[model samples]
Target: QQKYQPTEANLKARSEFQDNKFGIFLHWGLYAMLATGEWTMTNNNLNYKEYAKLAGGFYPSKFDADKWVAAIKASGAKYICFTTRHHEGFSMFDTKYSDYNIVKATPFKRDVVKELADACAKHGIKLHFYYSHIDWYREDAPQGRTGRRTGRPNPKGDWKSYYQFMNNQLTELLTNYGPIGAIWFDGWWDQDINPDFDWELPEQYALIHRLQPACLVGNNHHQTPFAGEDIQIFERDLPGENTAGLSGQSVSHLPLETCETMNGMWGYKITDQNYKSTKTLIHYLVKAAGKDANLLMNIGPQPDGELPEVAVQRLKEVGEWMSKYGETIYGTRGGLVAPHDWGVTTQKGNKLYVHILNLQDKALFLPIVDKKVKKAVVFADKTPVRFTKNKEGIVLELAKVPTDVDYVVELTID
Candidate 1:
């Protein structure tokens, strides 16, 4: 139990992470050329060697690091978690461990990760890396579920080589990138059935912390938080239940995050016209904040190194919404009251932000555990809202509901 306790420095980093209520998750790769999802190597069932051909013509000619980071920064996001390598096994960075990387293998020659790191540094946005443990290209990598049809040799693979390769890349990433926010790992679940397989995450994690103690480590393994994990992640799910009484996971004592795509697919797919509207995305962010979790909203950039046009517009629009309701989210915690069907609550010290998503009626009750209310008013305009405090809790009589997608009521407590 004592081991689970966090050091003062770790606590500070974790606290800053929690305060970054919103973020962007980028899933971009050579798969963008196929106009298929990130798993095209397996989903399309192409041979690993055949799939590697995409590398030669993989130049994203229009790729501009400043534009990408500026757009993401303008979206009111404090950080960007980018996929340095997805399950397809193509490294998006300049990796000395492998020749199959953006700078070495592709005509683009420039290191995408380095350019992005510099851009993020200039724009004041924290950059995080998304590294996949599943590899379809390497012969040393053992076969896993999902990538089975990639046609690697059936013989037992050299896991020692595989892990060393990974560690070397991890070292390069940590050392080259300046002060990374966290390493958001994926694909550990690929080998879930293998009993004796050791991911060797502890040593890898040790390398990360040793390089930069402030860098956080979080794995998207869909399991309980592990020993060295600094944050717990949920996929297409929230840290806590919402009005619908559904939660994607059990809450961890560590900092929490929920990552979801802006559209149906994480990687670019030409046919995927399914995109969540601005209102829906805004609601997801507010609800996540009220649940005391950061929402890592994802976007899949196109093959040409440009974010999809529609996603860009949505990001700008979300930025506009943030300019108005941004303060309600940026640095708040959620625990004052359990979520009600109508909405949820977020707090920052003496001020409470009641985000009303569904206006069930003009009346609302919040079972605030402590602190006496001094005043209640519309969050947008300081117009006072009538309220009464009884043993049940604070009850508010709404004069009228604001037309904004999220109508927030601000209350001051003493």
Candidate 2:
């Protein structure tokens, strides 16, 4: 809304998000194993006192950070972002200021952040923390509207003190378990005395860059990707004709991320039975990559600290598909022309990858400039395929259609 100054750190952070185009978003914690969304406390309309009781029995013996890391790598994701703490304000790591963390408050008594960060590092995947700025569970947290619930009592007492608590938890997350790639913020919006509130972003960015120089921070700063922030994210869907015209409107300029669910809900919900099929998942990933955007696909593990069999199996299947075709997806830019019929285009140097999103055997047309299709081949075996071109565009006739996820064809465009 207002013209804000951007810094070099912002520029660099955006570039990083752009470079790592594929990543996994994990929403876990006491909630993940709780058979509820991360916002369970507020959604259930439970008072903080009663909601706090979950900690006593919060034993996640089956939590395996390494296995989670492996699954992400196997899925061909280049980075990982996990919830260090969601809106409920439960910290997964030990906090000096509060005994309400994983180690002190819960029976499981393990630093989930440390384990995840270490596993990410060892596995060579970049690690990032998705921190919810508003702590609903904190007694002093200011009452404000949040993602799921809003009309509740604000945590009373000193605002400065709570800010410090947040700072301390962040410090632990950054210093103890990092070189984190980014700090993605959630629950930043809060109810205040003023109709409009000015955030102390300058101070926030100063602390972030000073503490973790290479680390990036992103909160949905309206359309303008704030000066200190590195990336911009489009939730659920991409921007349309109206929002696309603004200077920092979409995720294009900086590190861009799009958060979407593999299933109906982010946190584990037993009733959210609708899960995205492998084809649908792959299509979204390809579409995002084609637009030069990062796909941050999410999974909500069940309350038992184990991934649901359906979720894990589907992920594995998707991972298997990526293992074979990752080269075409990762680090590749959108092709010369836009998609036609039901396909997307990706490119690298002189090479182009045409993904037939919704398989059809008819003539396929492309939208582009100067590029000519030298040859066409199936993605699986790279077997030569026949091609033809009319005044409309180049067309390829495939011998078979993709019965599963990500049907791809390679085009040697010149």
Candidate 3:
């Protein structure tokens, strides 16, 4: 087991992250302007030089940070994780270290990150910066194992210099920004280029701590928790589940998080009409909570700097549900007997929240709980629930099964 002795500030941040349980993930970049999706460059094996042309034309004139933050707030998310930089090597924030950034390369000179940070502060939502560790455009960037299809020429630049550039950009991110909740790093899995390359993760983690000890650090390497990582993130999978095959590593004790796209795509894809319904998205959130992990639901804003209508509607609907049954999610812990075939269980204090998702069976025979139940009732309506205790477990008698949405039954246990 790996353990991290973080500073007091980091410890508090971790606690808050656990309590949050849900957050909004943004993957906007020059690719959003292309409207082809975030992976348009790599997926098509397009030349990096040609794809870089989009940076000059990238201008989201209608970009409204307040509106974005408002939508996320309405979704009942406690935090906002915005992409400050993505693999395309475009920096959303104003970074002196990079000329290929929003402030310099685009007609929209506004600092998107700054505006978002201010709006988040006004709305009382913590902000997290998602910075990519991979860069396809930068010649100095170490060649990752993946993204080879991007048609990028061999790098003539040095790794140490690229590392310095990254450090400078990271420094700017931590310093210029008000107070970041965490730094969510992606693209660290490109190990084929330099498997043992000392990313100076220890030094970078230390620098972040020195700047803002409260800012937690998490990497999406699809591996076990690293030594200095403050959070363990599962990409498109929950803890202990490897259906995605990317999360085969063992689960860690670190604060856990799982990121999933509302739709199939990470960034704006004009053709991506396959949107997940409000009910399905809510179920994802519920399942993540059941695993004692936070779910960072992603939204890819259109090139016009507006969230897709489907994404907006789904967030609104999920927010409506959270308004009703959020208690079962926020500040709850898992492991009240693993998720059952019917649904999942979450615990907070002496109250056990049994989320009957499917409701396939009339009577739910839950695994035996050590505690004695004083009473059971429907969480939403507080309607009395009939139940019986047996050697196997407690049997909850379902009088009526709800349609569409998940039905939560609250048990007052001793």
lDDT string for model 2 (316-405, tens) is 877888889888887686666665557678887677888777765554556543556788888778898787777767667777665545
Q: Point out the higher-scoring one by lDDT: 2 or 3.
A: 3
Model 1, range 179-232, lDDT digits (tens) per residue? 899999998888888866789887888788878788899998878888889999
lDDT computed for candidate 3: 0.86
Regions more than 4 Å wrong, model 1 = 1-6, 241-248
Residue 114, candidate 3: how far off, in angstroms? 0.4
Local lDDT at 248 for model 2: 34
Report residue 5 deviation for candidate 3 (angstroms).
Answer: 1.8
Winner of 1 and 2 under TM-score: 1
Taking all chains together, each candidate's TM-score versus the true structure is 0.96, 0.87, 0.96
Q: Local error of candidate 2 at 316, Å?
A: 1.0
Cand. 3 TM to true fold: 0.96
Q: What is the lDDT of residue 66 in candidate 3?
A: 94
In model 1, the Cα lDDT at residue 232 comes to 92
